[PDB]
Ligand binder design. Structure first.
Ligand SMILES: Cc1cc2cc(C#N)cn2c(C)c1Nc1ccnc(Nc2ccc(C#N)cc2)n1
Ligand SMILES: [Mg+2]
Ligand SMILES: [Mg+2]
Ligand SMILES: [Mg+2]
Ligand SMILES: [Mg+2]
Lengths: 549, 408
């Protein structure tokens, strides 16, 4: 007898104030009962479970199901109730690795630890809560009562406790072998390295011995590269997404489009330049999966371009920590941005995209900024560092923008790449009033009940306009007043408004907007040489005139 | 040697707060520091049965090459029971000529933590690309940055400093979180020697060698001022009237009528308007009113302090601390260039730290900030520039305020 180290149990409690499960065992067929008796006899013999006396009040339902194997029975304990009453655990499975962060490995071996799973003991004081009952033949005897001594399949705490026990066991082996990597997924251990295959198989045997010290046996594998893992294909020197197939359809429902957008989003992390906007714009205000939605021409074009990008396999390379990280961004239009992250030119570690946030007004520079922050954050997650940026914006443009912008804003180290369309500032307001330029005092108002209103201006040269408006509001008429002033002035103009709303919008410097009015104003601004916008308080007896009702 | 029992507030579980992405260097730093702390029994490894988490990162404090672990305990702190010693905070601290800030946090590590509360201090050192399980720890002792640490350690601290306080009766000592604020009116060199006396006094009785020197008596504030001009344009008068209208929400007697009478008629913005006598008198009277303090301004310890910051351009920032709107407890301005000339966010982060420091000295707590920045930008970059061992609360303002104009 070679003494094996015990695996320390994890103390487990029920959620506070909650008791164990008490759930009636279902009636089962005589066949299923005999099957369950046999299975549980084997399990008991292996030490996985133990017969318990009448004292234990707790119960969890057990089921017998025809196995995935053609001839066999399988035991299914249904732990939903116990799971509801079981404490939350630390879940280490959160935030899965991204393949673009992995390092290339000369060899990667798989080791089945499935047997090690049942070597993991369940906390003694918690075992009673796992009690279950095999119903007796014809209900004429007490059912056979069992409880688990090991982590039960389907129980809430089993994956986290398994993982943490395995990690704790592997820690000294990993730390004393820095030239390999070890990763645990399901019932498998994966061991990569760059060593010669002899030295590699050696380290593997050493690992099997190390595991043996806890009495953990490995089968001495079916799985080999490429690995299909969490939606990817991992190869020794390269990775990609599992095949992306865009279905042919004469018609699309909401569900079809959702699935399509999901495939496209998943593909976008490697296939460069994927666009989802025109396809996603169909999905808003539906909620009915079966509802057939006709595709717009724009959606059709987007889908076609996607099909073209997806026509043949693309691969990302892995991360080399000795080389710098570079991120490059392009504007695709309609609030869509796309990016590539690489180290050596033309070999992408990964790709991606950014959609503008839902909002009333926006501009290209803000969007580029957001894309930069997103890429920065993802990059710190994946590589632990910020990439060098290549951006379609001139240094001078950025300088002007952030120096004059009312908000603090920043972009990490970056350089201009000249690849149209370039991001630019479309208009720039004046900081001081313009000498020689006509001064327009604007105002607007609307009756809240009738929704009748007026917008207009009076200037220093005696120029004047008042336009009557129907179906409008105060804010709309203030904007419309400014629009009129822009429309009717020369290339240089001073505009005086009392509207805090309009000033609030314009000082945000949008180059685009949901409101067609704001859009028209922006077009006007673009056409101007110089615009000074001044605000005054309303109702103070200033040259801004009502006049407008 | 004996742990004081600690509990959370009734009806509240421990914090579960996601660890945010950390850079490679911060991760290495935290692994070294935490390895040493584990060897020193300050922290212990924990298992999956501890669901709780508090975020962690590392900072380099003022003029030092050594990383310092920083836990963001804000959630735990608001969830932690109010500890009532049964402090009024010193009013004389801000009146002293020089205040030196010392990092006394290390001391906390000498007092064991209540067992049943330890689980709530759980934190994670993440791995790059989550390729290895995050290293999980909890605190065996009073952690730096936790609300309960100064409250618990207070009895020890007062006893440690009895000789120094008794023999230096005019020196004002205040403790906030990990920091010791020592004010005195002495000469700067003599001051530094007395501070050194205090830190050796601490070393004897159990990185405190650093110091941060503030001169509260030199804190400038910001009364409202109006322009003095020989010739006023229409634009000048419009801006003046806007500003006075804004001041009238604060100061009762502000009048714009006569000044407004110059803005009747539609005139070129750059045209010069001679002031009438009634207008000049109105201006003079307004100027007088603005020299008086604001009516009905009081601090209430039961209420939040609120801080607003405006970017004025060219590295200049204005700020206001208040509890109620248009009742300003303090206003200020920073023209400071500290290593930040090309970086807005670094500037803002330093402004936030300075304002928080001032707020701690004056009222003994920290304001909730309203930051002129997008959430994503701030959240991405602020930990890179953070030098302070506490952290305040903040929100974000996405609509440009008009008030910027009026604060300069
Ligand atoms: C060893 C490792 C293996 C592994 C198998 C699966 C699955 N299924 C998932 N794994 C993870 C996540 C690992 N962990 C790490 C850690 C560092 N670098 C790599 N690089 C790397 C390179 C090539 C391949 C291939 N083929 C696989 C990993 N992997
Ligand atoms: Mg009978
Ligand atoms: Mg494909
Ligand atoms: Mg008006
Ligand atoms: Mg960063």
């Amino acid at each position: 007898m070679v003494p094996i180290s015990p695996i320390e149990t994890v103390p487990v409690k029920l959620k506070p104030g909650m008791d164990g499960p008490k759930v009636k065992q279902w009636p089962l067929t005589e066949e299923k009962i005999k099957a369950l008796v046999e299975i549980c006899t084997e399990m008991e013999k292996e030490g996985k479970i133990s017969k318990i006396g009448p004292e234990n009040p707790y119960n969890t339902p057990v089921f017998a199901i025809k196995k995935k194997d053609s001839t066999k029975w399988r035991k299914l304990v249904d732990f939903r109730e116990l799971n509801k009453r079981t404490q939350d655990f630390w879940e280490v499975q959160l935030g899965i690795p991204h393949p673009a962060g992995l390092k290339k490995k000369k060899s990667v071996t798989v080791l089945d630890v499935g047997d090690a799973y049942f070597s993991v003991p369940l906390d003694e004081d918690f075992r009673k809560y796992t009690a279950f009952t095999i119903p007796s033949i014809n209900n004429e005897t007490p059912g056979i009562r069992y409880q688990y001594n090991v982590l039960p399949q389907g129980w809430k705490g089993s994956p986290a406790i398994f993982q943490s026990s395995m990690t704790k066991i592997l820690e000294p082996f990993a730390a004393q072998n820095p030239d390999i990597v070890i990763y645990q997924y399901m019932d498998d251990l994966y061991v990569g390295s760059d060593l010669e295959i002899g030295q590699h198989r050696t380290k593997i045997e050493e690992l099997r011995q190390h595991l043996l010290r806890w009495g953990l046996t490995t089968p001495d594998h079916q799985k080999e590269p490429p690995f299909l893992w969490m939606g990817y294909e991992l190869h020794p020197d390269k990775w990609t997404v599992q095949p992306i197939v865009l279905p042919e359809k004469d018609s699309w429902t909401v569900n079809d489009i959702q699935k399509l957008v999901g495939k496209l989003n998943w593909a976008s992390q490697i296939y460069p330049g994927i666009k989802v906007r025109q396809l996603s714009k169909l999905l808003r205000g539906t909620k009915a999966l079966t509802e057939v939605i006709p595709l717009t021409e724009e959606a059709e074009l987007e889908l076609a371009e996607n099909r073209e990008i997806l026509k043949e396999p693309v691969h990302g390379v892995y991360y080399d920590p000795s080389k710098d990280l570079i991120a490059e961004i392009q504007k695709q239009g309609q609030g869509q941005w796309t990016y590539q992250i690489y180290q050596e030119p033309f070999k992408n570690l990964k790709t991606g995209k950014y959609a503008r946030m839902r909002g009333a007004h926006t501009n290209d520079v803000k969007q580029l900024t957001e894309a930069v922050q997103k890429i920065t954050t993802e990059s710190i997650v994946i590589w632990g560092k910020t990439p060098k940026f290549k951006l379609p914006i001139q240094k001078e443009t950025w300088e002007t923008w952030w120096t004059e912008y009312w908000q603090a804003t920043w972009i990490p180290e970056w350089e201009f790449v000249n690849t149209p369309p370039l991001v630019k500032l479309w208009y720039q307001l004046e900081k001081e009033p313009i000498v020689g330029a006509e001064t327009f005092y604007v105002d607007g108002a609307a009756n809240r009940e009738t929704k009748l209103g007026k917008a207009g201006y009076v200037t220093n040269k005696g120029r004047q306009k008042v336009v009557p408006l129907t179906n409008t509001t105060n804010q709309k008429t203030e904007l419309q007043a400014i629009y009129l002033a822009l429309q009717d002035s020369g290339l240089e103009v001073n505009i005086v408004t009392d509207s805090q709303y309009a000033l609030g919008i314009i000082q945000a410097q949008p180059d685009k907007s949901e409101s067609e009015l704001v859009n028209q104003i922006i077009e006007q601004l673009i056409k101007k040489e110089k615009v000074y916008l001044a605000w005054v308080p309303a109702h103070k007896g200033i040259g801004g005139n009502e006049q407008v009702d | 040697i004996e742990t004081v029992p600690v509990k959370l507030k009734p009806g509240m579980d421990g914090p579960k707060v996601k660890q945010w992405p950390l850079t490679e260097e911060k991760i290495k730093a935290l692994v070294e520091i935490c390895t040493e702390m584990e060897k020193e029994g300050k922290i212990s490894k924990i298992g999956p049965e501890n669901p709780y988490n508090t975020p962690v990162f590392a900072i380099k404090k003022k003029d030092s090459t050594k990383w310092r672990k920083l836990v963001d305990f804000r959630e735990l702190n608001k969830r932690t029971q109010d500890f009532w010693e049964v402090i009024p905070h010193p009013a004389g601290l801000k009146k002293k000529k020089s205040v030196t800030v010392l990092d006394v946090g290390d001391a906390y590590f000498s007092v064991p933590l209540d067992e049943d509360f330890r689980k709530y201090t759980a934190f994670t050192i993440p791995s790059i690309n989550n390729e290895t399980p995050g290293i999980r720890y909890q605190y065996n002792v009073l952690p730096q940055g936790w609300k309960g640490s100064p409250a618990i350690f207070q009895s020890s601290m007062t006893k440690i400093l009895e000789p120094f306080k008794k023999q230096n009766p005019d020196i004002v000592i205040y403790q906030y979180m990990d920091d010791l604020y020592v004010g005195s009116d002495l000469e700067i060199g003599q001051h530094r020697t007395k501070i050194e006396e205090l830190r050796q006094h601490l070393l004897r009785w159990g990185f405190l060698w650093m110091g941060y020197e503030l001169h509260p008596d030199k804190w400038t504030v910001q009364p409202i001022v109006l322009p003095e001009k020989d010739s006023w344009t229409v634009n000048d008068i419009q801006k003046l009237v806007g500003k006075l209208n804004w001041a009238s929400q604060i100061y009762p007697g502000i009048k714009v009528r006569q000044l407004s009478k110059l803005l009747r008629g539609t005139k070129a913005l750059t045209e010069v308007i001679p002031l009438t006598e009634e207008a000049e008198l109105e201006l003079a009277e307004n100027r007088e009113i603005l020299k008086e303090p604001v009516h009905g301004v009081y601090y209430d310890p039961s209420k939040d302090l609120i801080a607003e910051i405006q970017k004025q351009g060219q590295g200049q920032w204005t700020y206001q601390i208040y509890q109620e709107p248009f009742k300003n407890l303090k206003t200020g301005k920073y023209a400071r260039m500290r290593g930040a000339h090309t970086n807005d966010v670094k500037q803002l982060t330093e402004a936030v730290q300075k304002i928080t420091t001032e707020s701690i000295v004056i009222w003994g707590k920290t304001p909730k900030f309203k930051l002129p920045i997008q959430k994503e930008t701030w959240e991405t970059w602020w930990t890179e520039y953070w030098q302070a061992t506490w952290i305040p609360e903040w929100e974000f303002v996405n609509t440009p305020p008009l008030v910027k104009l009026w604060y300069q």
